[PDB]
Point group: C2
């Protein structure tokens, strides 16, 4: 032990020597982690005791103890610490603070025993995340960052690159499992870092297991980022197996606190090490400690009680091989070489933080007094912890020191990379991590531009993306072709009527509209027939007007021929008017004229038959004109006057009409959708007028002393009966998806024309060449 | 300290003295919990050291220490325990076991320090449930049951009575809160113990808060069981406030480990204490310890180092009031009184269990050797704990001692009750709890038969019970009256057709069936008319058969009167046949006869008119008979031969018919549901036969040299036309919910009868009185 005297004595623990399996500490004196830390703590104390404005007139002393890398051995030392609480007796000293427990195993139960006695310790090389809970180590603190502040950094550098799908290797131990658990715990918080697999390697791998794990990694090829937490030999063996397995250019390694910047894990694996995101703890070097340690001799340091063994093992001298007492008076380079240990910037920080806490304590309790105080003759653990956990200052290497509520210092890492460069090896810094992510993506080279490890490639408008369940990371796209529009990016809902989905990138384009018009394959026949019919009717009217006084006319034509000719003309007017496009007016007049024409014709013939029969068994010319012009015509004139068949133009626009399935093509109609029942009622009224004339022509089939006109009346009525009987089933041939406007319209117009021709051609059109 | 020497030395801790607020233990020496336990441990040790078959040749020694009811003070003693691990030096002794830490606060951190050094302790008066986890007190054990083994008992006695709804009071401390949390944790596991409220009282109640809490308990009146966890004064004040508030006979108190059997919590509250389920720890008394403690003097016990103070405070003597050296040589009853402390049966048990564990250890490691062993010269903590936690033996008062995996002894409680008995007070045992529930419900008296605290009273068939959400304890019942049947206890689904829910306890009773039958208010008219009609027709046929040769007959009747009379008879046959119940056959023949009758009549009249007209402008009698019997009758004979109107009997059973809402009453019909369109077609055919006869009667309205029969033919046809024109809207008066079988049937039968009478009464029925 090193019993330095002081007004405020604070102790320490260091890993000097090693675990002695023989029941006694086996002589090692590692002297890299043991000596370089006692000397650093004593250097820090000597510097603090020589600063006029750090602790003022107060001085410090240190009781240093030696943990032999074991826990149970450290227990007796920890007990020795608390000896002022329980015959030339020596008054024992009261410890106010312990700096030690470098190994994380010693830290745990040393923290237990010290928290049972209210002593705030500040560890320097204990990074296990399990010491970050104020329920079993409430008095613990650490200047070194915990291992759970690195995984978060990884997440950041995972996110800032763009990756959303990674693997997670994990060695068997306390380091790898805790690191991977921390990474998974931070994963769920923000998402977007979906982990595909989670492998697990044993401490002692049985022959032939590495290939199995690597092929397990080859389950999902889309996960090309491996976030490893393993040891040097594990990294080497994984990389060698990957190289042998001929699966290069497929993996993007993500380092940890164990890959660092060493060239040892890849000696022949330089080819299969391209890409590294290894995260290493920020380092530094203390010139003052070097100037102290290199200027010590065997008669300048009696404080240290293990310095003879260090003067022996550093020079081979055994005092009492070579029995050389002095040799390297300067131990810098005379014998062997000097290499300041890495974790020498965290014991000076602990000592300085304790001193700063004590100084802050002295400035508040009893200000205005130099030296020791009646309110400061016994330090309290709770107050000292409160002052420790509120320090902010710049220490060695200009690094701020601060603690959280638990007492965990913030992390400060650097990030490296590994890639070929003109057949060589080089770990350039590609950024750092000090409370945030700092990157140098311009100085990055994945020897591919920028690779990625995203689960699902971005989707494309036209095929709907659905997010899978359990992990919002792998969206599956499914095609929803059909009669439907994409309301939003994903959902493709029903596309409204009159709006037909198209073949463009996205759209619902208007359905083309069709309708029979003047020029058409099924349009020449009725217009040709109708023009020929009006030519014939004009020829007939020319014959009748060129000779009217002639007695051949006096058999008719007094008041009947005018009406009958008007009806025959209106029938051809119907023939021309049915087929025209029913935009606004064409379909309005349709029913009115359709009635009136054949009404004139058939009512005239009916009254002619009735009057010839009655005179055979009031034929005055104006009387006959009155009884013809208003017998059945007035009925339809009143029907037109109060619209029953002629509704206001429906113009039912046929967006649907025949609902064409698989709407790659469809049709729309501009028909005037007056119901077929209107055709039924008009036809029925006309046939009702026809029935009486046909019957009364049947009855007088043979009549003497009568003109030759009486028989053709019957012949025309018979022919019209036949043509209408043939017509009506063709009307009942509608309601077929084939042609709703090509069958019915041609049928009706041809029937009308043929009836007009029969009534004309066979009745009074002949026997005119004579006149 | 008491330094007894032995081969295996095991130490102890006891509550001697009390907490000294002055920074020095204030002299109390309670001597009930301090002295009676050192003497008990030393008695146990002396007995074990005098048993030839417990530890054989090995002997035991004890180092006793004094915790002054504090934790921090106990720390120095605990450190003193471990002194063989760290100038006339004395070799120190190695402790193999610690019995102590009676106070639950000392137990915690003493367990911490001892588990840091692998020493198995066995506590005896520490019941806090927080010491039952093998993650911070892995080396702890206790012979006294934990406080979490009582709540479960309560649950059992809550369940075995039948209660499913209780309140939960909880004092402010470690006892009440832990007990209530344990009760709630056991509550969710099995359910059926739904807790209504959870109150909370402060350590120092502000004036006027007790009434507030008691009225909070009066929120839900259905929760009449109060499971209390409080302190003596809290129980007293709650009961006094309840008494004052005039809310007696409404609460069923449930005690705890703090109500016991004391008469102090209810001095004037005897009236408002009726009912108690107080659970107290099973007790006992040790005669050997009494014989030891009462036989000690001031010169018989130098072992104890606090026995002078006990000889002083137990007798007032101050040595050096009254300066009396000896006084009560026997301290049993000479001065003051003796009362063995309650927790004296749990230190002897701890010592005996440790001794048994050591004995078991000596029987397995190196058997066949008497004394100490080279394999037993250093006890191991893990093995000793394994042997401690596997002991089974009968100790003092015949109580088995055994530990769980944690090291918690099973609980053994007794249960009391408190009720008036002839104006007195008495705590009879009503059962016990030793690993199960044992009750004496026959010896229970709630001074009500057996009360209950169930949330919802049991429901009743007819009104469906629905379980509320969050707690399956308070079922709400809702009435589902209507057209629905209870498939199971709760759900009342749709009751099937033809099956009408009833007013019985539960059922769906068949709907009554109705149909017009022979006797009915709307049935006398048609049968009366029809019988009178057949009487008239018989009179007429008598007239015609009594005189046939008479020339008055020779105007008709050659081949026409027979057919016409047959038709008139069949019309009245229809009149009788329509109203009969259409069970199997009645509706089958209905259409056939309905046709045939009026067919005969009207076809006969039609052929008569046609033949009289034709002879006025082939009247051979057999020729006329042939042209009448087959003119229109053969048509219906072929129609009957190939059934078109007469379908196979439908007999559509009218389960629904008019679907009567609010089915407290309804109707069912047995109608033969031949569609009305069959009536339409029969009527249409008959009218078609009628039309020609009516027209040809119209045409010959006036005919010379013809018999007087020619005009009544026309008159009857006119009257029948009128009656049918009046009839058809009455047919179109159907499809009304009022009367589907009372309107149409009477209408049809009366129309048939009137038509028959008109054709008969006005045509050939007159002009017969002459003949």
């Amino acid at each position: 032990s090193i019993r330095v005297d002081g007004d405020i004595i604070l102790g320490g623990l260091f890993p000097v020597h090693a675990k002695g399996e023989r029941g006694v500490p086996c002589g090692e004196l590692k002297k890299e982690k043991g000596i370089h830390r006692l000397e650093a703590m004593l250097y820090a104390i000597d510097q603090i005791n020589k600063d006029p404005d750090l602790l003022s007139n107060i001085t410090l002393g240190v009781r240093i103890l030696d943990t032999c890398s074991r826990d149970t051995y450290a227990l007796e030392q920890s007990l020795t610490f608390v000896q002022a609480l329980i015959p030339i007796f020596t008054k024992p000293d009261k410890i106010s603070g312990v700096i030690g427990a470098a190994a994380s195993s010693v830290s745990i139960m040393v923290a237990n025993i010290l928290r049972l006695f209210k002593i705030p310790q500040i560890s320097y090389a204990s990074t296990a995340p399990e010491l970050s809970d104020n329920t079993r180590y409430d008095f613990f603190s650490r200047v070194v960052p915990p291992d759970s502040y690195q995984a978060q950094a990884m997440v950041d550098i995972v996110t800032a690159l763009g990756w959303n799908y990674v693997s997670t290797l994990a060695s068997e131990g306390n380091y790898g499992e805790s690191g991977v658990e921390a990474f998974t715990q931070i994963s769920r918080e923000i998402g977007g870092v979906c982990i595909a697999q989670s492998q697990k390697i044993p401490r002692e791998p049985r022959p032939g297991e590495f290939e199995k794990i690597i092929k397990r990694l080859l389950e999902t090829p889309n996960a090309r980022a491996v976030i490893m937490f393993a040891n040097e030999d594990d990294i080497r063996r994984i990389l060698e197996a990957a190289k042998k397995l001929n699966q290069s250019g497929h993996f993007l390694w993500i380092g940890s606190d164990s890959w660092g910047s060493k060239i040892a894990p890849v000696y022949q694996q330089e080819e299969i090490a391209e890409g590294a995101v290894t995260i290493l703890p920020k380092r530094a070097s203390i010139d003052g400690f070097d100037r102290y340690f290199r200027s010590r001799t065997l008669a300048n340091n009696r404080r240290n009680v293990w310095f003879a063994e260090f003067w022996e093992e550093n020079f081979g001298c055994k005092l009492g091989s070579h029995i050389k007492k002095c040799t390297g008076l300067e131990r810098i380079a005379r014998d062997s070489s000097y290499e300041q240990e890495g974790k020498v910037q965290f014991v000076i920080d602990a000592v300085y933080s304790m001193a700063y806490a004590l100084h802050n304590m002295h400035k508040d309790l009893c200000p205005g007094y130099i030296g020791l105080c009646p309110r400061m003759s016994t330090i309290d653990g709770k107050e000292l912890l409160g002052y420790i956990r509120a320090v902010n200052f710049n220490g060695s290497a200009g690094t701020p020191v601060t603690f959280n509520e638990n007492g965990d210092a913030p992390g400060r890492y650097d990030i490296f990379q590994y890639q070929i460069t003109n057949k060589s090896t080089e770990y350039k810094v590609i950024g750092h991590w000090t409370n945030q992510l700092h990157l140098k993506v311009e100085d990055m080279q994945w020897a591919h531009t920028h690779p990625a490890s995203v689960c699902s490639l971005p989707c494309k408008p036209g095929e709907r993306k659905k997010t899978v369940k359990g992990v919002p990371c792998c969206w599956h796209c499914e095609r929803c072709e059909g009669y439907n529009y994409q309301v939003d990016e994903l959902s493709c809902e029903l596309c409204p009527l009159d709006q037909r989905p198209n073949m463009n990138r996205t759209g619902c384009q208007l359905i083309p509209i069709i309708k029979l018009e003047w020029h058409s394959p099924w349009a020449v026949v009725p217009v040709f027939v109708a023009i020929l019919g009006i030519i014939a009717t004009t020829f007939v009217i020319v014959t009748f007007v060129r000779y009217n006084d002639t007695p051949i006319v006096r058999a008719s034509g007094r008041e009947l021929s005018y009406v009958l000719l008007t009806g025959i003309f209106l029938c051809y007017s119907i023939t021309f008017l049915m087929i025209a496009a029913p935009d606004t007016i064409i379909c309005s007049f349709r029913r009115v004229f359709l009635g009136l024409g054949m009404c004139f014709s058939y009512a005239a013939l009916l009254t002619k038959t009735n009057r010839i029969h009655r005179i055979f068994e009031k034929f005055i010319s104006p009387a006959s004109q009155l009884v013809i012009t208003f017998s059945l015509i007035s009925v339809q004139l009143l029907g037109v006057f109060v619209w029953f068949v002629v509704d206001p133009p429906h113009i039912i626009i046929d967006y649907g009409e025949q609902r064409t399935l698989d709407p790659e093509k469809a049709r729309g109609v501009l028909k005037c959708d007056i119901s077929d029942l209107s055709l039924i009622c008009s036809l029925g009224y006309s046939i009702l007028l026809m029935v009486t004339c046909t019957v009364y022509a049947i009855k007088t089939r043979g009549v003497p002393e009568t003109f030759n006109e009486a028989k053709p009346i019957g012949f025309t009525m018979y022919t019209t009966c036949i043509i209408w009987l043939a017509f009506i089933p063709i009307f009942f041939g509608t309601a077929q998806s084939a042609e709703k406007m090509y069958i019915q319209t041609t049928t009706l117009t041809v029937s009308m024309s043929l009836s007009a021709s029969v009534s004309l051609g066979m009745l009074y059109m002949p026997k005119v060449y004579i006149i």
